[PDB]
Swiss-Prot record:
This is Amyloid-beta protein 40. It comes from Homo sapiens (Human). Cu(2+) 2 binds at residues 6, 10, 13-14. Zn(2+) 2 binds at residues 6, 10, 13-14. It comes from the Eukaryota. Glycans are attached at residue 10. Changing residue 5 to G: 60-70% zinc-induced amyloid-beta protein 28 aggregation. The record marks 1-2, 7-8, 16-17, 19-20 as: Cleavage. It is found in: Cell surface.
Length: 28
């Protein structure tokens, strides 16, 4: 996401945290 599903159209908190988890590794 650029900026429309982060701070301009929420992020659901179902997918954003997934890629974020994958960013960390698997959110530890």
């Amino acid at each position: 996401d650029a900026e429309f599903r982060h701070d301009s159209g929420y992020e659901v908190h179902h997918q954003e945290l997934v890629f974020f988890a994958e960013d960390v590794g698997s959110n530890k």
